[PDB]
Coordinates of N, CA and C and ligand atoms in Angstrom, one line a residue:
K116 N 76.1 60.4 -88.6 CA 77.4 60.9 -89.6 C 77.0 60.3 -91.0
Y117 N 78.0 60.7 -91.9 CA 77.9 60.4 -93.2 C 78.6 59.2 -93.7
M118 N 78.4 58.5 -94.9 CA 79.0 57.4 -95.3 C 80.0 57.8 -96.3
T119 N 81.2 57.2 -96.2 CA 82.4 57.3 -97.1 C 81.8 56.7 -98.4
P120 N 82.6 57.2 -99.7 CA 82.3 56.5 -100.9 C 82.4 55.0 -100.7
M121 N 83.4 54.5 -100.1 CA 83.6 53.0 -100.0 C 82.3 52.4 -99.4
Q122 N 81.9 53.1 -98.1 CA 80.7 52.6 -97.6 C 79.6 52.5 -98.5
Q123 N 79.4 53.4 -99.4 CA 78.3 53.7 -100.3 C 78.4 52.5 -101.4
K124 N 79.7 52.3 -101.8 CA 79.9 51.1 -102.8 C 79.5 49.8 -102.0
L125 N 79.9 49.5 -100.9 CA 79.6 48.3 -100.1 C 78.2 48.1 -100.0
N126 N 77.4 49.3 -99.7 CA 76.0 49.2 -99.4 C 75.2 48.8 -100.7
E127 N 75.6 49.4 -101.8 CA 75.1 48.9 -103.1 C 75.2 47.5 -103.3
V128 N 76.4 46.8 -103.0 CA 76.7 45.4 -103.2 C 75.8 44.7 -102.2
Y129 N 75.8 45.0 -101.0 CA 74.9 44.5 -99.9 C 73.4 44.5 -100.2
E130 N 72.9 45.6 -100.6 CA 71.4 45.8 -101.0 C 71.1 45.0 -102.3
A131 N 72.0 44.8 -103.2 CA 71.8 43.9 -104.4 C 71.6 42.4 -103.9
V132 N 72.5 41.9 -103.1 CA 72.3 40.6 -102.7 C 71.0 40.5 -101.7
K133 N 70.8 41.5 -100.8 CA 69.6 41.6 -100.0 C 68.3 41.5 -100.9
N134 N 68.3 42.3 -101.9 CA 67.1 42.6 -102.7 C 66.7 41.7 -104.0
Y135 N 67.7 40.7 -104.1 CA 67.6 39.8 -105.3 C 66.4 38.9 -105.1
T136 N 65.7 38.9 -106.2 CA 64.4 38.0 -106.1 C 64.6 37.0 -107.3
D137 N 64.1 35.9 -107.1 CA 64.0 34.9 -108.2 C 62.8 35.1 -109.1
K138 N 62.5 34.3 -110.2 CA 61.5 34.4 -111.1 C 60.0 34.7 -110.6
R139 N 60.0 34.0 -109.4 CA 58.6 34.2 -108.7 C 58.7 35.2 -107.7
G140 N 59.6 36.0 -107.6 CA 59.6 37.2 -106.8 C 60.0 36.9 -105.2
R141 N 60.6 35.7 -105.0 CA 61.1 35.4 -103.7 C 62.5 36.1 -103.5
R142 N 62.5 36.8 -102.3 CA 63.8 37.2 -102.0 C 64.6 36.1 -101.3
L143 N 65.6 35.6 -102.0 CA 66.6 34.5 -101.3 C 67.3 35.0 -100.1
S144 N 67.5 36.2 -99.9 CA 68.1 36.6 -98.7 C 67.5 36.4 -97.4
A145 N 66.1 36.1 -97.4 CA 65.2 36.1 -96.2 C 65.9 35.2 -95.0
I146 N 66.2 34.1 -95.3 CA 66.8 33.2 -94.1 C 68.3 33.6 -93.8
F147 N 68.9 34.4 -94.5 CA 70.3 34.8 -94.3 C 70.3 36.1 -93.5
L148 N 69.4 36.9 -93.2 CA 69.3 38.2 -92.7 C 69.9 38.2 -91.2
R149 N 69.2 37.3 -90.3 CA 69.2 37.2 -89.0 C 69.2 35.8 -88.5
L150 N 70.3 35.3 -88.0 CA 70.3 34.0 -87.4 C 69.5 34.0 -86.1
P151 N 68.9 32.9 -85.6 CA 68.3 32.9 -84.3 C 69.5 33.1 -83.2
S152 N 69.1 33.3 -82.0 CA 70.1 33.3 -80.9 C 70.7 32.0 -80.5
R153 N 71.8 32.0 -79.8 CA 72.4 30.7 -79.4 C 71.5 29.8 -78.5
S154 N 70.7 30.5 -77.8 CA 69.7 29.6 -76.9 C 68.6 29.2 -77.7
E155 N 68.3 29.8 -78.9 CA 67.2 29.4 -79.7 C 67.5 28.2 -80.6
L156 N 68.9 28.2 -81.1 CA 69.4 27.3 -82.0 C 70.8 26.7 -81.7
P157 N 70.9 26.0 -80.5 CA 72.2 25.6 -79.9 C 73.1 24.7 -80.8
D158 N 72.5 23.9 -81.6 CA 73.1 22.9 -82.5 C 73.8 23.7 -83.7
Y159 N 73.4 24.9 -84.2 CA 73.9 25.6 -85.1 C 75.3 26.2 -84.6
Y160 N 75.2 26.8 -83.4 CA 76.3 27.6 -82.9 C 77.4 26.6 -82.4
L161 N 76.9 25.3 -82.0 CA 77.9 24.3 -81.5 C 78.5 23.6 -82.7
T162 N 78.0 23.7 -83.9 CA 78.5 23.1 -85.1 C 79.4 24.1 -86.0
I163 N 79.0 25.4 -86.0 CA 79.5 26.2 -86.9 C 80.6 27.2 -86.1
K164 N 81.8 27.2 -86.6 CA 82.9 27.8 -85.7 C 82.7 29.3 -85.7
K165 N 82.3 29.9 -86.8 CA 82.1 31.5 -86.8 C 80.8 31.8 -87.4
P166 N 79.7 31.9 -86.6 CA 78.4 32.2 -87.0 C 78.4 33.6 -87.7
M167 N 77.6 33.9 -88.8 CA 77.5 35.0 -89.5 C 76.2 35.2 -90.2
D168 N 75.7 36.5 -90.3 CA 74.5 36.7 -90.9 C 74.7 38.0 -91.7
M169 N 73.7 38.4 -92.5 CA 73.6 39.6 -93.2 C 73.6 41.0 -92.2
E170 N 72.9 40.8 -91.2 CA 72.7 42.0 -90.1 C 74.1 42.1 -89.5
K171 N 74.9 41.0 -89.2 CA 76.4 41.3 -88.8 C 77.2 42.0 -89.8
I172 N 77.0 41.5 -91.0 CA 77.9 42.3 -92.2 C 77.3 43.7 -92.3
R173 N 76.1 44.0 -92.1 CA 75.6 45.3 -92.3 C 76.1 46.1 -91.2
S174 N 76.1 45.7 -90.0 CA 76.7 46.5 -88.9 C 78.2 46.9 -89.1
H175 N 78.9 45.8 -89.6 CA 80.4 46.1 -89.8 C 80.6 47.1 -90.7
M176 N 79.7 47.0 -91.9 CA 79.8 47.9 -92.9 C 79.4 49.4 -92.5
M177 N 78.3 49.5 -91.8 CA 77.9 50.7 -91.2 C 78.8 51.3 -90.1
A178 N 79.7 50.5 -89.5 CA 80.7 50.9 -88.5 C 81.8 51.2 -89.2
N179 N 82.0 51.2 -90.6 CA 83.2 51.6 -91.4 C 84.4 50.6 -91.2
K180 N 84.1 49.4 -90.9 CA 85.2 48.4 -90.6 C 85.6 47.7 -91.8
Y181 N 85.0 47.7 -92.9 CA 85.5 47.0 -94.3 C 86.3 48.1 -94.9
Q182 N 87.5 47.6 -95.4 CA 88.5 48.4 -96.1 C 88.1 48.5 -97.6
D183 N 87.6 47.5 -98.1 CA 87.4 47.3 -99.5 C 86.3 46.2 -99.7
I184 N 85.8 46.1 -100.9 CA 84.7 45.1 -101.2 C 85.1 43.8 -100.9
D185 N 86.5 43.4 -101.3 CA 87.0 42.1 -101.0 C 86.8 41.7 -99.5
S186 N 87.0 42.6 -98.6 CA 86.8 42.4 -97.1 C 85.4 41.9 -96.8
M187 N 84.4 42.6 -97.4 CA 83.0 42.2 -97.2 C 82.7 40.9 -97.9
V188 N 83.3 40.7 -99.0 CA 83.0 39.4 -99.7 C 83.6 38.3 -98.8
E189 N 84.5 38.5 -98.1 CA 85.1 37.5 -97.2 C 84.1 37.0 -96.1
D190 N 83.2 38.1 -95.7 CA 82.2 37.6 -94.6 C 81.0 37.0 -95.3
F191 N 80.6 37.4 -96.5 CA 79.6 36.7 -97.2 C 80.0 35.4 -97.4
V192 N 81.2 35.2 -97.8 CA 81.7 33.7 -98.2 C 81.7 32.8 -97.0
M193 N 82.0 33.5 -95.7 CA 81.8 32.8 -94.5 C 80.6 32.2 -94.3
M194 N 79.6 33.2 -94.4 CA 78.2 32.9 -94.1 C 77.6 31.8 -95.1
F195 N 78.0 31.9 -96.3 CA 77.5 31.0 -97.4 C 78.1 29.6 -97.2
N196 N 79.5 29.6 -96.9 CA 80.1 28.3 -96.6 C 79.4 27.7 -95.3
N197 N 79.1 28.6 -94.4 CA 78.4 28.0 -93.2 C 77.0 27.4 -93.7
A198 N 76.3 28.1 -94.5 CA 75.1 27.4 -94.9 C 75.4 26.1 -95.6
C199 N 76.5 25.9 -96.4 CA 76.8 24.8 -97.1 C 77.2 23.6 -96.0
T200 N 77.9 24.0 -94.9 CA 78.2 23.0 -93.9 C 77.1 22.7 -93.2
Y201 N 76.2 23.4 -92.9 CA 75.0 23.0 -91.9 C 73.9 22.3 -92.6
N202 N 73.7 22.7 -94.0 CA 72.6 22.0 -94.7 C 73.1 21.1 -95.7
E203 N 72.2 20.3 -96.3 CA 72.5 19.4 -97.5 C 72.4 20.1 -98.8
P204 N 73.3 19.6 -99.8 CA 73.3 20.2 -101.1 C 71.9 20.1 -101.9
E205 N 71.0 19.3 -101.5 CA 69.8 19.2 -102.2 C 68.8 20.3 -101.7
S206 N 69.2 20.9 -100.4 CA 68.3 21.7 -99.6 C 68.1 23.1 -100.3
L207 N 67.0 23.7 -99.9 CA 66.7 25.0 -100.5 C 67.7 26.1 -100.1
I208 N 67.9 26.1 -98.8 CA 68.9 27.0 -98.3 C 70.3 26.9 -98.9
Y209 N 70.8 25.7 -98.9 CA 72.1 25.3 -99.6 C 72.1 26.0 -101.1
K210 N 71.0 25.7 -101.9 CA 70.8 26.2 -103.2 C 70.9 27.7 -103.3
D211 N 70.2 28.3 -102.4 CA 69.9 29.7 -102.3 C 71.3 30.4 -102.2
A212 N 72.2 29.9 -101.1 CA 73.4 30.3 -100.8 C 74.4 30.3 -102.1
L213 N 74.2 29.4 -102.9 CA 75.0 29.4 -104.2 C 74.6 30.5 -105.3
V214 N 73.3 30.7 -105.3 CA 72.7 31.7 -106.1 C 73.2 33.1 -105.7
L215 N 73.0 33.3 -104.4 CA 73.3 34.6 -103.9 C 74.8 34.9 -104.0
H216 N 75.6 33.9 -103.7 CA 77.0 34.0 -104.0 C 77.4 34.5 -105.4
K217 N 76.7 33.8 -106.4 CA 76.8 34.2 -107.8 C 76.4 35.7 -108.0
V218 N 75.3 36.1 -107.3 CA 74.7 37.6 -107.4 C 75.8 38.4 -106.8
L219 N 76.3 38.1 -105.7 CA 77.3 38.9 -105.1 C 78.6 39.1 -106.1
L220 N 79.1 38.0 -106.7 CA 80.2 38.3 -107.5 C 79.9 39.0 -108.8
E221 N 78.6 38.8 -109.3 CA 78.2 39.5 -110.5 C 78.0 41.1 -110.1
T222 N 77.6 41.4 -109.1 CA 77.5 42.8 -108.6 C 78.8 43.4 -108.5
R223 N 79.7 42.7 -107.9 CA 81.1 43.2 -107.7 C 81.7 43.6 -109.1
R224 N 81.4 42.6 -110.1 CA 81.9 42.8 -111.5 C 81.3 44.0 -112.2
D225 N 79.9 44.1 -111.9 CA 79.3 45.3 -112.6 C 79.8 46.6 -112.1
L226 N 80.2 46.6 -110.8 CA 80.8 47.8 -110.2 C 82.4 47.9 -110.3
Ligands
5KL513 C1 67.4 27.4 -91.1 N1 68.4 26.5 -90.8 C2 68.2 25.1 -91.4 C3 69.6 26.9 -91.5 C4 70.1 28.2 -91.4 C5 71.2 28.4 -91.9 O1 71.8 27.6 -92.4 C6 71.9 29.9 -92.0 C7 71.1 31.1 -91.6 C8 71.7 32.4 -91.7 C9 73.1 32.6 -92.1 C10 73.9 31.4 -92.2 C11 73.2 30.0 -92.2 O2 74.1 28.9 -92.5

């Protein structure tokens, strides 16, 4: 089937976050795309109440479950807040979550 205009707007925001690269050309999204399975990483799933990754967000988007951009932002904020809970502020993952959140809000503003 085809994508609604809203779905196309969401996908542009999604792809912006996914494709963002720092000054060295590293994609900050890499660790956020796909969490390991609960058997692979039990301590994550036993610590974080609502596990979330970019692939889960992309599925919800393609299933036409987000009503507007603020709905999808809510799930990005969950993912990023989870990364801040699970990791330390000095860590690379924690820092990248903050950059990508900024990229997300700046993309929403541009659109
Ligand atoms: C790789 N370990 C240290 C942490 C992973 C995450 O914190 C994570 C990955 C994907 C989505 C959310 C996360 O908190």
